From TrEMBL, chain B:
Name of protein: Uncharacterized protein
Coverage span on the entire protein: 98 to 193 of 1539
From TrEMBL, chain G:
The protein, known as: 3-hydroxyisobutyryl-CoA hydrolase
Shown part of the complete sequence: 147 to 387 of 1451
From TrEMBL, chain H:
Species: Tetrahymena thermophila (strain SB210)
Domain of life: Eukaryota
Domain S5 DRBM: from-to ranges: 167-230
Molecular function terms from GO: RNA binding; structural constituent of ribosome
A Pfam family recorded for this sequence: Ribosomal_S5
GO CC terms, sorted: ribonucleoprotein complex; ribosome
InterPro entries: Ribosomal_uS5, Ribosomal_uS5_N, Ribsml_uS5_D2-typ_fold_subgr
Stated name of the protein: 30S ribosomal protein S5
GO terms of biological process kind: translation
UniProtKB/TrEMBL annotation, chain I:
Highest taxon of source: Eukaryota
Organism expressing this protein natively: Tetrahymena thermophila (strain SB210)
Residues that span the membrane, as ranges: none
Protein name (record): Ribosomal protein S9
Family: Belongs to the universal ribosomal protein uS9 family.
Phylogenetic classification of the source organism: Eukaryota, Sar, Alveolata, Ciliophora, Intramacronucleata
């Protein structure tokens, strides 16, 4: 019962007037990761920035496309619904995949397959969004782990 | 993974209910489920799946632990009609 | 309750999206679709599709989803009306008349 | 006219750069400039047609009738309105050879 | 020139009319923000 | 509207007053409507309606054309048929990609002797790839696994993210626990008959 | 940006804090000492002290109390973030403005939301009046249609005729040349300087983010006891506690 | 396999001591029973333990009578369909119609058999509209595109082709090469090219083919993909001098209030077809290589930084803006040409 | 628990459960078509006898 | 009892129909303002408690356990069945081994039929005044029915004052009490308010 | 001091306890007002 009489106490003694909320506001965006500048935290400077870029993009209902090693996952969003759609593929490099991109209005691309390295060289030309960490110059045992962390910080916000 | 246990189906329904009403009216569930998601979470349905299992003929679910079951679902806000029937019908069987 | 609501309302706003999945009208369309996946996988579990075979897959998914969102519709009952369907499928036509 | 802005001062320059930058190819083309100044003898007669244009492009959708059209429900969901490209710039690229010629 | 117009248009005001004594608007936007500050101070009197 | 007198003057639209006064609102219409709409046909047969729109308790503020983009499905929740146009197997005759397959004198023995024209047509007369989908559509409604895994599929895709973001927040690399998922039958470990 | 690195006592305290980005570092000591001298705080100090949430303004003008920088920012007198170090300012700074330009405008970002919003309202209008014919021609005009062979035609028309009466009412007062019907968007810079530029700087030199409350002072005692419109009542309610 | 048999035995032996042919303890066993017999807790112990092990079930199965053998659970749904009563045909009539209507609606859409309607090509666009009605009147870009078709779409359409403004292309050299083989010599015709707007857009390509006209068509493909954008302010383009040295070659720019094209008429265009209007240039080249014109012209412009950047990253200040009066300019406006 | 100072015993490798929860999904499909394909192949055997 | 509290709860369902038809729902856009009847979770119970009622009245013959009989009555009482409860309250004679719920779960019956049951009220109250293990709601309910019976004691009131100083309760039955008793010049701490 | 588009400003009146006499005030206006109109400068920083 307290939930009721608490909630009523608000609307009686509150009126959030929101004609000025059209303006950009980084309220509703915060940090969640511990940080303190040392040489071994240079990864985390990126990931904190990755949130801040993307929590701004929370409100978009735009479909998503993903590359995985032999699967593909797609999230066809609209104003009206949201659905997941999987597909197996032995060769994800096929030229067929421009047909999903049109049928479903994909506006954002992600990659998590270490082998699909012809990605940045191709889709960088097209105006849509990318997210890659493979052609960075480090060793590879790390670069897998970033391609997951990249994949997690994003999809925690878009969905 | 082991099977059916009278305690776990009961006391989980207790320990859950006692948490939420302890936090407060507008709690700060950060990574938790909310009320809206527990009722939807498949991890919650297995309780009701196992709780109805305890209301079968062949199984022995003690009646004292139906009390904790039914008094806690009141708190969480989950209401079937079957669990009323299948519980009442079972106490009609212990006596007969 | 208000000495913490800065951070929680961020995360809370994300959780509500999970419940903003579209409502349904026609659960049969969900059953048809779930049947289609299990056929979709078998025929192409060992190999990959072609292009034209791939449109046939994805386009069925796009059209059945609408029925999930769109109201159920009238449906046929009569045996004669049924047989015309098979004829419309099997490319047969009533020539004898 | 309106107040001036930093935009127009930029485009008051690009209007000046482009004419006066590139060397002209050939002298014989002078003969073909008069086609323009023929038209200025007639613009008052072709004045109405300007307004049939500049209504048709910008201020015609306001007044259009409701020509009923069948539209498939499938396509009406995936609707996204955006700009794509300008058509004045669909033209070829042109040569400029001054090492040899 | 634009964001001024684009602001007033959000409040269903005609930005392009010459009828405006600016100091009168500036009196109201002060008072709108004053009224929302009234309600807030009530809780700062009750929570007190 | 210009003087804010709608709600004062005009009463709000009600399904009742429409129904009591249909015929006034239809006089200027054609007649084919006015025949199908009549108190005689409809009361008989105990026909049905469902009020797909009325269930969606909308306000007129959700009908301004700007909000019309987020609510199109709600306005038109019902699906229309697809007109059988001239498109037909006959079109495949004059097409050029479609080369007609001539057949021989001998190809007639199997077509009719195997299946008589007197019998009705059934599922066995269809292709196998379609005959299987029916067999799937008739079984998945009963199978516990598929109905469970598919209801909950999106949720597994989210819980793995929320669990992962903790570890990115608590700088530890992400990682999976044991037995987070349910039990599902591993049918290989189970002894099933080779033949039912 | 202001780094209060030492003490302040008086008119200077009520002045420099009136900048949006005054920062109370560790070494601050913020007093108000006028009442020790029979004098009252001036320089518009009465303004902000009254706007505080829990009558701290009366606590401090009357009683000269030292407030560390943390408790200063959290209270609302100054900027919520707080200053850590004078170290590597210049380099982290330059990286920020390399990203964020001020030659941009609300024009360049939002000068085309108009024509998108307008094409919707006319495109969708075509769909509605066209989509209706598909409903009517299918549910009604046909003598037999398997999708609606069984339905009360007298009712389904009302469900349509109930709908159309509402898309009259709302869409009234709709002239497409209007601009009030659009999506209006602008851009604030100073707030954008707070939130989207200081990110490169809030890693080391200031706190990136706001956090915590005031506990060095018992607030709940202050609120009950320093509320009244007199003094002789205040000492009583203190003396009860 | 002598070393193998030794290992296999020792683990066979270890497994058998885990088996219990005997009792372990009696006080525990008796106390275990008295506790459970006290109130009837035995049945729970039998049911639960019997489920996740068969060995205890096999012992106790004999004491049970009246056994039942249901089907296996996975084969249960299939077992019900085969045993469909006459009443269940009522369902199967509906479930037969629900799919036929689907397969019917497919054959209307021509989705029944496979089909190709989408163009999934990545063939770029190259040199179109050679003669199409000349020009049109200049209009504004206010009429967007609508996705009326789930088949058509503008995905996979590059920006470098999608760029609005229009370019010239500039010749620098054509050459011929030879590759020697056992039987024959082969000529790979070559061509090179340059292109850029006056507003800081620029690029270079390298053509290669079996005809001059083909290396042309190839080189343009490379340039448009090889485009870059230069930092540039239309006001006071060049703040500082620059130097770019490729082998045996060096370009030097110094700023000038006016433009001084004295030198290579090429570079006078190239400098202008970036926008560097405020400059004088120079060349230090004993003998020329046309691959050094480019490669030194692109170490140079990219060292250019706008004044506002130079004010950020260094303490210098080149100009300063002022919404100021004309009286302090003698009523003449600064023409920045 | 004192044997290691920097490693946790509950957690395991990332991306494991995707596999195991996926392989199961395949194995039902393999099983489900046996019971199906047989049901049709009965006819071609017994309709001919 | 737990079933009653689970069925008397006014809560919409996770799925399905709250009300016995879609028909009755049009009156009830809100839920907690509705009544017991139209909920499905209630009427389906009464089918079964009735069927159980015959089954219990047979076994409960010749019983002497207090703690069962009082608890049966409260269950049938909370549903809308007193005539079943009356019999079980008439059968008990001994008062041994109480739980304090059992005393209070009876006083609904003695309060609704005071002219029949008077000795039990006197007997049970003297027992509860001596018991230490009492919850605050049980003490609020105690004083609540003493008012209906006009059998109020300083002993009963003093228990509350020893038991409600430090916290309040979620029992609805305070506002009647803390407002009524002030007519008698009685006062309780802030936690009564 | 200038470092980029910044003005690291400082105060050095310590014998006088950085008091706000007339001469102190007329400089901080002389500085800050000068830094506004510098379009090249984009922020400042003050400190003792």
């Amino acid at each position: 019962m307290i939930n009721k009489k608490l909630n009523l106490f608000l609307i009686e003694n509150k009126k959030l007037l929101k004609t000025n909320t059209e303006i950009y506001n980084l309220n509703k965006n915060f940090n969640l990761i511990k940080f303190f500048k040392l040489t071994n935290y240079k990864e985390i400077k990126a990931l904190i920035s990755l949130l801040k870029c993307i929590n701004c993009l929370n409100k978009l209902n735009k479909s998503i496309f993903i590359f995985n090693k032999n699967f593909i996952t797609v999230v066809y969003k609209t104003n009206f619904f949201k659905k997941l759609l999987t597909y197996k593929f032995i060769n994800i490099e096929l030229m067929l995949t421009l047909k999903l991109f049109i049928f479903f209005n994909t506006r954002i691309f992600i990659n998590t397959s270490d082998t699909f390295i012809k990605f940045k060289s191709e889709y960088e030309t097209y105006p849509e969004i990318l997210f890659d960490c493979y052609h960075n110059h480090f060793s590879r045992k790390r670069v897998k782990n970033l391609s997951y962390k990249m994949f997690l910080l994003i999809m925690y916000n878009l969905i | 993974r082991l099977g059916f246990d009278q305690k776990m189906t009961s006391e989980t329904l207790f320990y859950l209910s006692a948490t939420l009403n302890s936090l407060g009216p507008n709690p700060n569930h950060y990574f938790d489920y909310n009320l809206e998601l527990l009722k939807d979470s498949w991890r919650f349905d297995d309780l009701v799946g196992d709780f109805r299992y305890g209301l079968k003929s062949g199984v022995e679910f003690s009646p004292e632990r139906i009390a904790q079951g039914l008094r806690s679902l009141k708190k969480l806000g989950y209401s079937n009609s079957r669990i009323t029937r299948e519980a009442i019908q079972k106490i009609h069987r212990m006596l007969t | 309750s208000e000495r913490s609501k800065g951070e929680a309302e961020m995360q809370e706003f994300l959780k509500k999206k999970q419940m903003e999945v579209g409502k349904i009208r026609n659960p049969k369309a969900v059953e048809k679709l779930n049947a289609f996946r299990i056929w979709r996988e078998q025929k192409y579990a060992n190999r990959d599709p072609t292009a034209a075979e791939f449109e046939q897959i994805m386009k069925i998914e796009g059209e059945l989803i609408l029925e999930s969102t769109l109201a159920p519709y009238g449906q046929i009952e009569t045996d004669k009306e049924i047989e015309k369907t098979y004829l419309h499928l099997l490319d047969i036509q009533d020539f004898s008349d | 006219n309106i107040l001036k802005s930093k935009k127009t001062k930029i485009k008051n320059l690009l209007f000046f750069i482009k004419y006066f930058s590139v060397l002209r190819k050939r002298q014989s083309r002078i003969f073909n400039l008069a086609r323009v100044k023929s038209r200025l003898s007639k613009r008052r007669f072709f004045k109405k047609k300007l307004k049939k244009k500049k209504i048709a492009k910008y201020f015609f959708q306001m007044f259009k009738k409701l020509k009923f059209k069948h539209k498939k429900y499938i396509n009406l969901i995936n609707l996204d309105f955006y700009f794509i490209r300008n058509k004045r710039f669909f033209r070829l690229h042109r040569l400029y050879d001054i090492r040899k010629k | 020139i634009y964001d001024v117009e684009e602001f007033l248009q959000s409040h269903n005001i005609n930005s392009k009319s010459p009828a405006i004594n600016i100091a009168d608007l500036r009196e109201k936007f002060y008072l709108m923000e004053k009224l929302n500050r009234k309600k807030i101070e009530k809780l700062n009197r009750l929570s007190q | 509207d210009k003087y804010n007198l709608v709600d004062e003057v005009i009463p709000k639209p009600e399904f009742k007053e429409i129904l009591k006064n249909i015929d006034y609102l239809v006089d200027q219409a054609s007649t084919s409507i006015k025949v199908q709409i009549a108190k005689e046909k409809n009361q008989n047969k105990d026909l049905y309606f469902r009020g797909n729109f009325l269930q969606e308790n909308l306000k007129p503020e959700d009908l301004m054309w700007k909000h019309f983009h987020n609510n199109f499905v709600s306005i038109f929740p019902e699906s229309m048929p697809e007109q059988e146009q001239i498109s037909q197997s006959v079109q495949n005759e004059n097409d050029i990609r479609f080369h007609p397959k001539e057949l021989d004198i001998v190809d007639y023995g199997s077509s009719n002797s195997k299946e008589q024209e007197n019998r009705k047509r059934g599922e066995r007369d269809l292709s196998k790839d379609n005959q299987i989908e029916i067999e799937l559509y008739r079984r998945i409604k009963t199978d516990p696994f598929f109905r469970h895994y598919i209801q909950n599929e999106i949720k597994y895709f989210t819980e793995r993210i929320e669990d992962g973001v903790l570890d990115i927040a608590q700088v530890i690399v992400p990682a999976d626990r044991k037995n987070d998922t349910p039990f599902y039958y591993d049918p290989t470990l189970e002894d099933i008959p080779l033949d039912l | 940006l202001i780094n209060i690195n030492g003490l302040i006592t008086g008119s200077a305290a009520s002045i420099f804090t009136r900048a949006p980005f005054a920062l109370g570092s560790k070494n601050t000591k913020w007093r108000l000492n006028e009442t020790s001298l029979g004098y009252i705080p001036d320089a518009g100090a009465s303004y902000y002290l009254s706007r505080l949430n829990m009558e701290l303004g009366t606590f401090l003008a009357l009683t000269g109390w030292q407030i560390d920088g943390y408790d200063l920012s959290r209270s609302g007198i100054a900027f919520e973030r707080m200053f850590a170090t004078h170290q590597n300012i210049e380099e982290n700074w330059k990286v920020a403005h390399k990203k964020h330009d001020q030659e941009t405008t609300s024009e360049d970002l939002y000068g085309l939301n108009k024509f998108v919003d307008l094409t919707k309202q006319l495109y969708y209008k075509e769909t509605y009046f066209s989509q209706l014919n598909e409903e009517v021609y299918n549910r009604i005009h046909k003598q037999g249609e398997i999708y609606y062979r069984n339905e009360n035609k007298r009712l389904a028309m009302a469900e349509i005729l109930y709908k159309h009466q509402m898309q009259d009412r709302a869409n009234l007062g709709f002239k497409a040349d209007d601009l009030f019907n659009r999506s209006h968007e602008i851009l604030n810079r100073l707030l954008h300087y707070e939130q989207c530029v200081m990110f490169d700087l809030g890693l080391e030199n200031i706190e990136l983010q706001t956090s915590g409350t005031v506990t060095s002072l018992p607030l709940f005692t202050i609120g009950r006891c320093f509320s009244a419109n007199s003094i002789e009542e205040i000492i009583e309610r203190l003396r009860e506690e | 396999s002598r070393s193998g048999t030794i290992v296999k035995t020792m683990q066979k032996i270890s497994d058998k001591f885990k088996v219990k042919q005997t009792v372990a303890d009696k006080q525990k066993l008796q106390s275990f029973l008295t506790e459970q017999t006290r109130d009837g807790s035995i049945k729970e112990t039998i049911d639960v333990t019997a489920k996740y092990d068969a060995e205890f079930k096999t012992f106790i199965k004999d004491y049970q009578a009246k056994h039942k053998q249901y089907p296996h659970i996975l084969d249960l749904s299939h077992y019900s369909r085969e045993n469909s009563t006459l009443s269940k045909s009522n369902q199967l009539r509906q479930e037969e119609i629900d799919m036929i209507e689907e397969f019917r609606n497919r054959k209307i859409k021509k989705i029944n058999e496979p089909i190709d309607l989408i163009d999934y090509s990545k063939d770029p666009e190259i040199n179109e509209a050679d003669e199409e009605a000349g020009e049109e009147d200049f209009t504004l870009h206010q009429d967007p595109y609508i996705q009326e078709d789930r088949n058509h779409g503008y995905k996979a359409k590059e920006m470098r082709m999608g760029l609005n403004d229009d370019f010239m292309i500039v010749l620098l050299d054509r050459d011929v090469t030879t590759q020697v083989t056992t039987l024959n010599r082969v000529n790979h015709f070559r061509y090179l090219i340059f292109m850029g707007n006056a507003n800081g857009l620029v690029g270079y390509g390298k053509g290669k083919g079996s005809d001059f006209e083909e290396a042309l068509d190839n080189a343009i493909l490379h340039c448009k993909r090889n485009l870059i954008a230069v930092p540039l302010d239309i006001f006071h383009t060049v703040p500082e001098p620059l130097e770019g040295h490729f082998n045996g070659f060096q370009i030097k720019i110094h700023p000038s209030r006016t433009f001084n094209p004295w030198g290579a008429p090429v570079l006078a265009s190239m400098l202008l077809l970036t926008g560097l209007r405020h400059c004088r240039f120079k060349t230090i080249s004993k003998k020329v290589n046309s691959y050094a014109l480019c490669m030194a012209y692109f170490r140079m412009i990219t060292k250019n930084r706008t004044p506002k950047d130079i004010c950020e990253q260094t303490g210098k200040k080149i100009y300063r803006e002022n919404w100021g009066a004309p009286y302090f300019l003698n009523h003449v406006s600064q023409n920045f040409l | 628990d004192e044997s290691k100072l920097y490693r946790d015993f509950e957690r395991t490798k990332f991306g494991s459960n995707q596999r195991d929860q996926r392989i199961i999904f395949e194995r039902h499909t393999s099983h489900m078509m046996k019971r199906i394909n047989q049901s049709l192949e009965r006819e071609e055997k017994i309709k001919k006898l | 009892l737990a079933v009653t509290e689970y069925s008397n709860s006014k809560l919409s369902e996770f799925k399905g129909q709250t009300f016995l038809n879609e028909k009755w729902a049009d009156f009830f856009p809100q839920v907690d303002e509705a009544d017991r009847l139209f909920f499905v979770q209630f009427l389906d119970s009464q089918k079964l408690f009735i069927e159980v009622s015959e089954v219990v009245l047979e076994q409960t013959k010749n019983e002497k356990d207090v703690n069962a009989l009082g608890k049966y009555a409260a269950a049938f009482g909370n549903i809308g069945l007193i005539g079943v409860s009356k019999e079980l309250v008439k059968r008990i004679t001994s008062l041994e081994g109480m739980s304090t719920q059992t005393g209070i779960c009876i006083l609904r019956v003695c309060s609704e039929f005071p002219e029949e049951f008077s000795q039990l009220s006197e007997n049970i109250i003297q027992i509860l005044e001596k018991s230490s293990d009492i919850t605050a709601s049980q003490a609020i309910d105690l004083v609540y029915y003493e008012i209906a019976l006009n059998k109020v004691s300083e002993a009963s009131l003093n228990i509350l004052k020893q038991q409600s100083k430090h916290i309040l309760d979620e029992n609805p039955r305070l506002n009647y009490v803390s407002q009524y008793l002030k007519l008698q010049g009685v006062d309780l701490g802030y936690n009564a308010s | 001091k200038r470092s980029g588009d910044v003005a690291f400003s400082y105060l050095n009146g310590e014998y006088k306890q950085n008091t706000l006499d007339t001469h102190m005030i007329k400089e901080i206006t002389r500085f800050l007002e000068s830094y506004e109109i510098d379009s090249s400068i984009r922020a400042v920083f003050l400190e003792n």
